[PDB]
RNA sequence: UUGACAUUGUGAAGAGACAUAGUUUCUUUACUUAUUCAAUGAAGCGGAGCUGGAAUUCAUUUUCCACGUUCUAGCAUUCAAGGUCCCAUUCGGGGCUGAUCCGGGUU
RNA sequence: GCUUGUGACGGCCCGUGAAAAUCCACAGGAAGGAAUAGUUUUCAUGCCAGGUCGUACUGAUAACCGCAGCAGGUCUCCAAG
RNA sequence: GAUGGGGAAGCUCCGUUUCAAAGGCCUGAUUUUAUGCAGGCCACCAUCGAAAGGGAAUCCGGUUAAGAUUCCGGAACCUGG
């Protein structure tokens, strides 16, 4: 009220500079983030391949949180951990004469995508883990079909940094069971069966199932206009 | 033998254009959120004289709807327009000399003048002193529109593609013999370095496809083909007719 | 949550930590002495006829004087290795290549006494 | 000019030496009249908009 | 310059063979992500919604246009005044709104 | 009067006869400011400093180019009766 | 004529703001302290290229065998602090 005074103002073209908007849609990004950008978009455009594509199928979150809690359960040796177990059988083994084993057989996750592969082939995982990303995506391509005829439950799962979280590395690539404590064999066969239904057994028919050929959304609703309109009246 | 001259105006040495004291680049408003949804206001500040050129430029003064500040843009002068007219630019805005408009937005018969191929690409039709262009057609879906150009073609373009109203000025310029030939000199010192021509005729064969001979003679057909090669183009290029042109011509 | 807010169109380069340098080994072991002390830096007395009258009816001092040096190093090194104070100092290169320093003494000081103080005449 | 006194460099009206005065009679009068033609275009369109 | 092959992908109608099931090949004409051209200190795109209103209602909306500037050679800038909420009231200062939502395809 | 400078004009052009550094001004009003005393250096006066390189002479029937102290060539200012 | 670049077997050729994450000023925040962060800006994108173009400011008298708008005398003016 006061000497205060209400001015209103006018943006309607021909008049008053325009306000400070937010034009982040608009930014002129640095190359490197136009293309990462493209390409994701590029990747989705073209009509992709069974094989690819039975990728994104994505683990679930529930599921997946219930099997990397189990995972964390049998993380493999810490520096300080095995440095300890050393001077432990390192002095013990050698006096109290024992045969290597004042040490207790070790239970832990399998990683690395060359030891997971002979581990698939000769039968001796129960639980393979594959991540989605993994950028030459052939080292891992041939996992749900290699998992599949040597008859291992797997499963595609979001992360490969977060398979590399559970094995102390920045990322991981595949992380994978084949050992387990009795205390665990139960919800692992659980684990096991959820994955199971989600994947192996739906192998057969997503392996028909081409994926992208996604238009663009100024495309999409061109013809969600186009062809509401056109048809019926 | 040598290079003929026409194959060296290519390097541009000498034959690169006088530049030094042009105005700068006639250019409409940039395509921009205004000139696309309804119109925007301008001040001719001045009309003024480009060097080498036939038609004046109008200098055309507009504020900038992103900032505070003046945006000065170079206008080729459509006859008529004076210095502290207001000019409108815009999709909806008034059809008078001066102002500039989509194609699409004016009616059959517009008189208009620096119209773009493209929409947006800042003029290129007709812009030389006394050209237009009028709309002869619409074509409502795909919006086209239909102009015939100073040489009589016809040709379509977007209904988006902006014209200006009117007649390019100082028409008439060319009614007006040279006289002589430093008024032809000062014209094309002003321009670039094509004047004057020596005759190929007159040269030596090393010269020119038409040099030598005991007499002055071209010695073969001056009509050469589409096909020729550098070196060999010079005459009447790809002349479809060639002799005095009787009757009237113009466009059906 | 969400996005950030650019109100402008252009991205620009982030503002990056630049650390100064710390080094690891020396640049040269040793810093070089000073290259143009008063001693390299005023040359000789000149002590042509002409320039003995610039001396006596002057109260001016003339020097060949390194190239090297300017008028500001010039009058600090006669200051400094004469005990005078100097009014201005005009310079020239001679055509030997050699710069010649004519030195002008302040009115407290009498350059013929300080000339032949420094031994010439 | 910069070693020269500010009154060498101005006349004490508005726009001082800078718009030469019959210059600023004019576009005093011309902003007046606009605005007041401005409050006049409004209640011409006010008045329309209720009555039509 | 003209043809073939490679860059080369996606629909649709039509021709063409195992001899009238659809793997395959060309004629047409669609698609956009390759490729290509233009523009801009990548500024207002595409989709929905508000209000108005032409419209004629065959139950009620089935739609279509709009949806801040044109007597005048002025003036238009300080995240905007206003409105409203916070800091613990200091001077300063911050959100929200003013300026509607949704998608990050600069057009 | 002569030479040069300059003004206000007038002729001409399909010719209408550079740029940038730099300087000032104005519109704006962020903000900062007095009565026990504040603002003010575009008013005056006052203090210190101003580096580096060139700087002679010739410039022509002998100091430059023409094999040279060559009747040739080689840009320009001042201009008495 | 460098530069992100694009050609070229390559000596190098093209481009000069060009399909580039291109850079720096004003003061505030310090009263561990010297200068991090706090705003708001401004997006101009190298550089060389005129001893006749643009351009801060000096004059008269005297003086040398040979320098002088440069020394001496007197009287000024400009830029920066
Ligand atoms: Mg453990
Ligand atoms: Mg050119
Ligand atoms: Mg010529
Ligand atoms: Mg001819
Ligand atoms: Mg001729
Ligand atoms: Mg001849
Ligand atoms: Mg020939
Ligand atoms: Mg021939
Ligand atoms: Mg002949
Ligand atoms: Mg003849
Ligand atoms: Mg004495
Ligand atoms: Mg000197
Ligand atoms: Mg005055
Ligand atoms: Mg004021
Ligand atoms: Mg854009
Ligand atoms: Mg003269
Ligand atoms: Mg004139
Ligand atoms: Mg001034
Ligand atoms: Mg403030
Ligand atoms: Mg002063
Ligand atoms: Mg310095
Ligand atoms: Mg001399
Ligand atoms: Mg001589
Ligand atoms: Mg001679
Ligand atoms: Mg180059
Ligand atoms: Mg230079
Ligand atoms: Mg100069
Ligand atoms: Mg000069
Ligand atoms: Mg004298
Ligand atoms: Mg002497
Ligand atoms: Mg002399
Ligand atoms: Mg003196
Ligand atoms: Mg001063």
């Given at each position: 009220?006061?000497?205060t005074?209400?001015?209103?103002?006018?943006?309607?073209?021909?008049?008053?500079?325009?306000?400070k908007?937010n034009?982040?849609?608009?930014?002129?990004?640095?190359?490197?983030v136009?293309?990462?950008?493209?390409?994701?978009?590029?990747?989705?455009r073209?009509?992709?391949p069974?094989?690819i594509?039975?990728?994104?199928?994505?683990?679930?979150?529930?599921?997946?949180?219930?099997?990397?809690k189990?995972?964390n359960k049998?993380?493999?040796?810490?520096?300080?951990?095995?440095?300890?177990?050393?001077?432990?059988?390192?002095?013990?083994?050698?006096?109290?004469?024992?045969?290597?084993?004042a040490?207790?057989?070790?239970?832990?996750?399998?990683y690395?995508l060359?030891?997971?592969?002979?581990l698939?082939?000769?039968?001796?995982?129960?639980?393979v883990?594959?991540?989605?990303?993994?950028?030459?995506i052939?080292?891992?391509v041939?996992?749900?079909?290699?998992?599949?005829?040597?008859?291992?439950?797997?499963?595609?799962?979001?992360?490969?940094?977060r398979?590399?979280?559970?094995?102390?590395?920045?990322?991981?690539?595949?992380?994978?069971?084949?050992?387990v404590?009795?205390?665990?064999?139960?919800?692992?066969?659980?684990?096991?069966?959820?994955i199971?239904?989600?994947?192996?057994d739906?192998?057969?028919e997503?392996?028909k199932?081409?994926?992208?050929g996604?238009?663009?959304?100024?495309?999409?609703?061109?013809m969600?206009?186009?062809?509401?309109?056109?048809?019926?009246? | 033998?040598?290079?003929?001259?026409?194959?060296?105006?290519?390097?541009?040495?000498?034959?690169?254009?006088?530049?030094?004291?042009?105005?700068?680049?006639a250019?409409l408003?940039?395509?921009?959120?205004?000139?696309?949804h309804?119109?925007?206001?301008?001040?001719?500040?001045?009309?003024?004289?480009?060097?080498?050129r036939?038609?004046?430029?109008?200098?055309?003064?507009?504020?900038?709807?992103?900032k505070?500040?003046?945006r000065?843009?170079?206008?080729?002068?459509?006859?008529?327009?004076?210095?502290?007219?207001?000019?409108?630019?815009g999709?909806?805005?008034?059809?008078?000399?001066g102002?500039?408009?989509?194609?699409?937005?004016?009616?059959?018969?517009?008189?208009?003048?620096?119209?773009?191929?493209?929409?947006?690409?800042?003029?290129?039709?007709?812009?030389?002193?006394?050209?237009?262009?009028?709309?002869?057609?619409?074509?409502?879906?795909?919006?086209?529109?239909?102009?015939?150009?100073?040489?009589?073609?016809?040709?379509?373009?977007?209904?988006?593609?902006?014209?200006?109203?009117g007649?390019?000025?100082?028409?008439?310029?060319?009614?007006?013999?040279?006289?002589?030939?430093?008024?032809?000199?000062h014209?094309?010192?002003?321009?670039?370095?094509?004047?004057?021509?020596?005759?190929?005729?007159?040269?030596?064969?090393?010269?020119?496809?038409?040099?030598?001979?005991?007499?002055?003679?071209?010695?073969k057909?001056?009509?050469?083909?589409?096909?020729?090669?550098?070196?060999?183009?010079?005459?009447?290029?790809?002349?479809?007719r060639?002799?005095?042109?009787?009757?009237?011509?113009?466009?059906? | 949550?969400?996005?950030?807010?650019?109100?402008?169109?252009?991205?620009?380069?982030?503002?990056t930590?630049?650390?100064?340098?710390?080094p690891?080994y020396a640049?040269?072991a040793?810093?070089?002495?000073n290259?143009?002390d008063?001693?390299?830096?005023?040359?000789?007395?000149?002590?042509?006829?002409?320039?003995?009258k610039?001396?006596?009816?002057?109260?001016?001092?003339?020097?060949?004087?390194?190239?090297?040096?300017?008028?500001?190093?010039?009058?600090?090194?006669?200051?400094?290795?004469?005990?005078?104070?100097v009014?201005?100092?005009?310079?020239?290169?001679?055509?030997?290549?050699?710069?010649?320093?004519?030195?002008?003494?302040?009115?407290?000081?009498?350059?013929?006494?300080?000339?032949?103080?420094?031994?010439?005449? | 000019?910069?070693?020269?006194?500010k009154?060498?460099?101005?006349?004490?009206?508005?726009?001082?030496?800078?718009r030469?005065?019959?210059?600023?009679?004019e576009?005093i009068?011309?902003?007046?009249?606009?605005?007041?033609?401005?409050?006049?275009?409004?209640?011409v369109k006010?008045?329309?908009?209720?009555?039509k």
């Open positions: 009220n006061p000497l005074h209400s001015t209103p103002k006018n943006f309607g073209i021909g008049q008053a500079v325009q306000p908007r034009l982040s849609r608009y930014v002129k990004w640095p190359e490197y136009r293309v990462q950008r493209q390409k994701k978009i590029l990747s989705i073209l009509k992709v069974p094989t594509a039975q990728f994104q199928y994505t683990l679930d979150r529930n599921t997946a949180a219930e099997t990397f189990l995972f049998y993380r493999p040796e810490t520096a300080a951990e095995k440095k300890e177990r050393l001077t432990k059988e390192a002095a013990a083994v050698a006096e109290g004469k024992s045969k290597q084993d040490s207790p057989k070790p239970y832990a996750v399998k690395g060359n030891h997971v592969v002979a698939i082939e000769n039968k001796k995982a129960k639980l883990l594959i991540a989605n990303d993994v950028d030459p052939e080292l891992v041939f996992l749900p079909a290699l998992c599949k005829k040597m008859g291992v439950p797997y499963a595609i799962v979001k992360g490969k940094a398979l590399g979280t559970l094995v102390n590395q920045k990322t991981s690539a595949v992380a994978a069971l084949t050992e404590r009795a205390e665990d064999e139960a919800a692992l066969a659980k684990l096991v069966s959820t199971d239904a989600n994947f192996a739906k192998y057969d997503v392996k199932h081409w994926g992208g996604i238009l663009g959304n100024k495309a999409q609703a061109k969600d206009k186009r062809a509401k309109n056109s048809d019926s009246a | 033998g040598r290079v003929i001259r026409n194959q060296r105006k290519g390097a541009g040495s000498i034959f690169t254009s006088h530049t030094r004291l042009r105005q700068g680049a250019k408003r940039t395509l921009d959120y205004a000139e696309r309804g119109y925007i206001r301008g001040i001719v500040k001045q009309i003024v004289h480009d060097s080498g036939g038609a004046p430029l109008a200098k055309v003064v507009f504020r900038d709807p992103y505070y500040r003046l000065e843009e170079i206008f080729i002068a459509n006859e008529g327009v004076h210095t502290g007219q207001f000019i409108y630019a999709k909806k805005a008034s059809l008078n000399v102002n500039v408009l989509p194609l699409g937005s004016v009616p059959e018969g517009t008189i208009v003048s620096n119209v773009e191929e493209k929409p947006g690409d800042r003029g290129a039709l007709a812009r030389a002193s006394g050209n237009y262009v009028i709309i002869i057609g619409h074509n409502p879906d795909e919006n086209k529109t239909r102009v015939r150009l100073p040489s009589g073609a016809k040709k379509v373009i977007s209904s988006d593609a902006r014209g200006v109203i007649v390019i000025a100082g028409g008439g310029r060319v009614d007006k013999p040279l006289l002589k030939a430093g008024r032809a000199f014209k094309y010192r002003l321009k670039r370095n094509s004047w004057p021509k020596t005759r190929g005729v007159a040269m030596n064969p090393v010269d020119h496809p038409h040099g030598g001979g005991n007499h002055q003679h071209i010695g057909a001056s009509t050469i083909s589409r096909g020729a090669v550098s070196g060999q183009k010079a005459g009447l290029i790809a002349a479809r060639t002799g005095l042109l009787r009757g009237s011509q113009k466009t059906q | 949550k969400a996005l950030k807010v650019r109100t402008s169109a252009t991205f620009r380069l982030p503002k930590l630049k650390l100064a340098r710390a690891k640049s040269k040793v810093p070089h002495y290259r143009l008063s001693y390299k830096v005023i040359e000789q007395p000149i002590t042509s006829e002409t320039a003995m610039k001396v006596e009816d002057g109260n001016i001092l003339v020097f060949q004087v390194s190239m090297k040096a300017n008028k500001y190093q010039i009058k600090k090194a006669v200051k400094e290795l004469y005990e005078v104070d009014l201005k100092v005009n310079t020239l290169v001679r055509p030997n290549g050699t710069k010649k320093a004519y030195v002008r003494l302040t009115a407290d000081y009498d350059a013929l006494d300080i000339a032949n103080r420094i031994g010439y005449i | 000019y910069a070693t020269v006194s009154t060498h460099k101005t006349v004490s009206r508005a726009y001082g030496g800078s030469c005065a019959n210059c600023v009679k576009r009068i011309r902003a007046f009249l606009i605005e007041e033609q401005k409050i006049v275009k409004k209640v006010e008045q329309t908009e209720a009555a």
